[PDB]
Amino acid sequence: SVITVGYLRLHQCGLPKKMALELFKPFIYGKLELRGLATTIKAAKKMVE
C-alpha cells in the first residue's frame, strides 16, 4: 500500500478494512465456522464475498 501519517499510539498501525478481510480471510472462515453462522466453508466464502 501507500504510506500516510496519523494521534495513534506508539504500538498501533492503521490498517484499512478492505485489506483486513482479504489477509485474515482463512481466519474469518474458521471463526465463522466455529461461531455457527456458516454451515459449510463455501457458504462462508459467499458470506465474505
Binding site: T39, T40, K42, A43
Partner: protein, 51 residues
C-alpha cells in the same frame, strides 16, 4: 460407488456378495437415495449443488 475403496462394483459385482437380486438392489439404492433427499439431512448437502 466405491467410496473408501480402491474400486466400485456393479449390480452383478455386489449381487454375488449378498444376494443376486437385480431389481431389489436397485430399489434399495433408490430408497437410500430418496431417504437422502429428505429435507432433514440434505440441508447441508443442498449447498453443494452449486459446485
Amino acid at each position: 460407488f466405491g467410496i473408501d475403496m480402491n474400486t466400485d462394483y456393479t449390480l452383478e459385482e455386489v449381487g454375488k456378495q449378498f444376494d443376486v437380486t437385480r431389481e431389489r438392489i436397485r430399489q434399495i439404492e433408490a430408497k437410500a437415495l430418496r431417504k437422502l433427499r429428505h429435507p432433514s439431512r440434505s440441508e447441508v448437502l443442498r449447498s453443494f449443488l452449486d459446485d
